[model samples]
Target: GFLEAALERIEKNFVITDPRLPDNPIIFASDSFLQLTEYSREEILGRNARFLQGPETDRATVRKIRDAIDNQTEVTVQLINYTKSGKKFWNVFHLQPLRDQKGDVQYFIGVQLDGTEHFSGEDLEKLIKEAKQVAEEIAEAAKLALLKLKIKEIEEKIKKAEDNGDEDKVKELREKLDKLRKAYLILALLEAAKKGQIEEVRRLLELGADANGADGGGTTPLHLAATSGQLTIVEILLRQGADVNAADNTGTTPLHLAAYSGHLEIVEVLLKHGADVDASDVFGYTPLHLAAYWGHLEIVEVLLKNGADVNAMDSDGMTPLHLAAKWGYLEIVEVLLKHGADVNAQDKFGKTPFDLAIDNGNEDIAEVLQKAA
Candidate 1:
């Protein structure tokens, strides 16, 4: 609350989104933030400013901006989330160590530019300096309020003290505070989950980090939590509304990551949350492709039962059966065979599962493949 007001006096209101899309629009939306908690805080914490310019809810300020409606288009200033990149999302600034209790309120200021707009080097340098200065002011406010409120709290505690014939003393002690963690919060969520910091992950969510927000590559929190072997983090992220089917730049989903790691329980949980078992990455390999080639018989069977096609093919036209046969996963071969694997299934080179078994010298799976044929 205090830090934001300082920025207000420093010049510049909190301006977020701008009109900049063709055919399909994000939202015809605009609203004023009090710059000091005059408006609701959480309401503006919208989803990462439509990273791909996708559509979203008419939740707030959507209809209020009707007067500015364009006959051909409208403007959208998003509370967008993004990281450092070759293209700029300039005027990027976040708050310092400011805290607001339940009864009180804290105002927030955020800004981002569309990636298409380029900025000169000097323009970037000056703005970065101002943002760093703004951060320092916010942090200064955090400490100022700490002392200003401490004496009032001391009075509240003083009521019960002053016992025994002598007296009680007020030490006027300082309440030490951790130096604020001023990293980009959304990316921090990914970093924390990647390293298995359960508590940090929890607080970051409550602090308004977008559960479904993605990095530049489209990797979401659920993507990391699933692959990191932390079922609890996965559960926590999902509970906070992480998309079960979120994908990365390569079109790989969490199910794909868990399948590659052979993490059965994580696989089960993702499926329970409605993960797409047949979902493929950019290269056309599905979760079943990974499990079979990586050799997890249980996951392969689980995927098959959960609707992963036993003969699903990858980019090279190698099916799960071909992967199992070539990888010498004997049980996987028999399992796929029992589940209706096509022994005659061929690769792009016309090599069938039978050929793969023989070429790889997988004698055990070769016998199974030949018999299955």
Candidate 2:
């Protein structure tokens, strides 16, 4: 405990690399180093330190360090390093060769310092900002490259839909293709909204990205924001005229996603904006059905308070109570019963919620059902 405590007190980031390894993998890293790099010890251990290098990292500085290591000498350089969150920082890297008693190099000790504050001139700041923008452009290009392949696959599906005489399917696919064609800003906006990047989302909106644009899978910015629990972004998108009740190709709405993911606040926001509380997906499972199936008691309560049908049945004739009983959620089952869910309601297979409890060998639930009966 004392040794661990002592090591933790060292303020400077320190890492040890095995020189005998082909790529000089990191064998040990201090807590400070992990904090500086925004990485966990497990993620950094047994990995080459070069993983920190990104698109804007200087190759000349890297070559200097490589030559110094090859000559078993010390080298110091300032290079760009990316954190786990994809944020970049200037790293003042110092490497020193550590030799054993036999005069053979065994390890390389590295000390890293955040040198971002050192570049303070106006021109330097502008250059650094430009570099960051370039890095962002590179990242966006990579995303677009992957999206191009998805666009091709969507094109093939559109052709198939036309051949099958499914006019609705063809129309849906064409809409998705249009969004993909506008891929630059709309795709970026969707990603920013999904990741809760509020400022970027705002900028994208100001740049005229359609708030209602959807991806190939029919997921919209509002859908992603709700599913990700991005409350602020959800509010912003809604204010920008995002369709709160807009359904995807599968008829899954933002409310359904928020309720299913147990995002209580987003559900409230959507409800306040007049979202359909009982909107059903392609399978006829409403948000209430999803919330009950997932055992989200609070979400179920919210939906019920907002006029969700307690005894609503899905395509299979299964009620929320039936789902709760089948999933063995005692609390949800109790909540549904208290809300006056039909205890004897039969499903498509002519099975009641009580029958499901008995069939699943849930004795405690079965007892409750028997008492209710």
Candidate 3:
């Protein structure tokens, strides 16, 4: 009666696992533990505690726990764990090794306290908002700092120009420094889009950030959003009349970024919005070339389906098949072959896909290419 009453009175979830058993199945669990995880006693018993792990669970924290267990030491850590219904919660996990009279470890005792409220959904949103505001403030401060430095540099140039009796040169330096006084709202918008901060991006756009404005390197917000797989932000930019075919300094388009990053959904959205499937960058590497070079088979398939040129040559004359074979991505090599990519296409160095595969000592791929030829 005392044991039952003590167990019922404890608020924290408690569990005991026999270390001798494989996977350390739960030998016993408290009612609080079952209630917290929304699992029946039958389901919780005889199952490894790892059932609580989910996609967002931090692997480092799990590693810490594993290390403690291996060393038979006590450890206390707060980690993200999922419930039976897939709801994420912060679990304050405290694990201790239970030892027998002879100092032999017999079992592991785990105590869990619910700490979800500190990291709940609303809390996460508030943190994101605060982070975005802080980032904007930092950007503004950096812009001012850069402006001050440029002003100082221009003042020195103007002094020299005036000393040399070149008033025109002094005026040009003044005008150049004056042009640098503008705010960099486009860069801020690009940062927000890349971070997948949809609300922040929308606010910046509404505040008159240029939809097609590019960075010094010519990378647009749309390109950043596409590469980061921010579909909603990409759509918003497109609806705001962002150029679908806009190219960066290296002539890399948003579609190329999407394809290279293997964002299939973003690739599809860009394609439907009139992205050039065969569009090439300054390196003459098309979206297909990028997908193949990166060994993104699904993206390669999508590009081909959109009428990408299978035999299209890059600046170095390397085709998609050559890139796939060079990287030794067998699946991509097979897919390209199925799509009728040239097996004997030569690069600037006169190396075919077969040649590259052979040089790389990819015997399997070389055989595939040879058989295709």
Candidate 4:
């Protein structure tokens, strides 16, 4: 009683009691300790303390502790052990083998404390058991993300290789993708970027990924970044030397992507990095033509400022101004006029900008064009 009282004072807020291994290693316990293990002092004394091992614990971890004990070294392990009533709990077991003056091993002292109030022992055990499955889910998700980035990296490699038309990197990536079970990682990453998950995107890139990979449509990640107006990803890919003019299977470049999405900032970045302002796709539609079709007044103005050809034609021979007028994009019509677009230029059908503007019933644009003419 006197020792307990003295211990209560020394350990103040701590619960003080005696442990089962009192004489051998002088195993002492706090009241909290007894409460944690749910073992009485008599039952806990000097029995190898192996009572703590349970089914849900990691066997490798248990082996480590046993090895440490045989080697007479200090060891710690988070383990599952049952309470006095067979209720399982998580215990942090810390053990140390004390040495004599001659460095001879003497007694093994241990302290087992509860670690599962915040996370129940069952829950923790479940988590331990499910760790690989969770990791697989994470790896599966990460694989998809990695797959897209790897595909993009491979694309970059293939482009460099294909400048010589070599098949080395392409073959490697095809094999890697074939071996992977998850292709949705790419889709998840694209969706992340779509939701402005910039940090997640950067995290994926830093983990040995390429920032410029494309989707099934030959649309590069940069294309999606541009579409989402993520200026940060745009800058990241560009600074990493992403091919600014890389075309999709359809020959749509990043500039075409930006113009189609009405992202002026992306359009400007592509141009700053030497994107072809008047470069045509497989269909012969230039970024300027796309800007005009979308009625993106600011993008049209920026393209014109960058010296995009106002009279450039598509496969159907429709000029920037012709599309702008037909779409009733009055602001675009004005911007084109300011940039020296020939209002009299005709398409394959011979319809002029004024004729299209009038046919679209855009009286304001028609008035503006007629005055300019």
TM-score of 2: 0.54
Off by over 4 Å in 3: 1-141, 144-182
TM-score of each: 0.52, 0.54, 0.54, 0.51
Better of 3 and 4 by TM-score: 3
lDDT of 4 by residue, 184-291 (tens): 444555556566677777765665455555665777667777788989878877776677888889999889989999998889988999999988999999998998
Off-target runs (Cα >4 Å) in candidate 1 are 1-183
Instruction: Return the candidate ranking by lDDT, descending.
Output: 2, 3, 4, 1
- Relative to the unseen true structure, what is the Cα RMSD of model 4? 22.0
Candidate 3, 180-222: lDDT as tens digits? 5333457668779889999999998888888898876898899
- True lDDT of residue 311, candidate 1: 78
Question: What do the candidate models score in CA lDDT, each in turn?
Answer: 0.64, 0.82, 0.81, 0.68
Please state the error at residue 93 of candidate 2 in Å.
35
User: Which of candidates 1 and 4 is the stronger one according to TM-score?
Assistant: 1
What is candidate 2's CA lDDT for residue 89? 88
C-alpha RMSD (angstroms) for model 2: 18.3
Candidate 1, poorest ten consecutive residues by summed lDDT = 173-182
In model 2, what lDDT does residue 196 have?
94
After aligning candidate 1 to the native by TM-score, how far in Å is the CA of 322 from where it should be? 0.5
Residue 241 local lDDT, model 3: 93
